[PDB]
Design an enzyme around this catalytic site. Sequence first.
Site: not given
Length: 177
Positions: A65-69
């Site tokens: 996902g876009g906010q993956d860490r």
Amino acid sequence: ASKLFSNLFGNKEMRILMVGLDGAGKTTVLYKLKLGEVITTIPTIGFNVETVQYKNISFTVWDVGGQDRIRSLWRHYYRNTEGVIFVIDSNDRSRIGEAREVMQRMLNEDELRNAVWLVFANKQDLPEAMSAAEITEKLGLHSIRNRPWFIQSTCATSGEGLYEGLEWLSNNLKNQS
Ligand SMILES: Nc1nc2c(ncn2[C@@H]2O[C@H](COP(=O)(O)OP(=O)(O)O)[C@@H](OP(=O)(O)O)[C@H]2O)c(=O)[nH]1
Ligand SMILES: [Mg+2]
């Protein structure tokens, strides 16, 4: 349990990473391949990974996902990857920008530099969805350099297009010991 992937895959060792945003249809793809039991592993709480092992072919799948860490473990999987399949929900225009962002990050990962790139423009059975050409443009695939890539239209529900894509992948995937 599916058909002739034995002839395709033969006895070679393809280590495949299949990712994409949640909802793209990756889990559906794994089950539709009917190549083996879909195994769920949770190497870290909250990080669900699905795997399928057929002879010397391995599929490792997880949601991005876009906010993956990104975590060290992700890169461990990356280093062991020979081919990447990025699944796209062709009917979700609201998230294509997010898919682009995620895929671009992956295209710039040192540990994935040698992996051939197969994109599944999934859910093509929906007439209102984007075409493969539209997705190719939005993802910026034509700007990719020094890396084999291919985009395949698919319907994970019916299994249409799955063989064609994996065929390209098997013929272009570069083995790494
Ligand atoms: N029309 C259509 N739908 C597809 C296709 N592939 C997967 N889907 C649907 O998309 C939803 C997400 O698929 P899933 O495999 O769980 O996605 P993911 O694993 O990538 O998060 C499911 O809807 P549900 O939650 O309603 O079961 C599934 O049936 C497709 O090719 N065409
Ligand atoms: Mg899933």
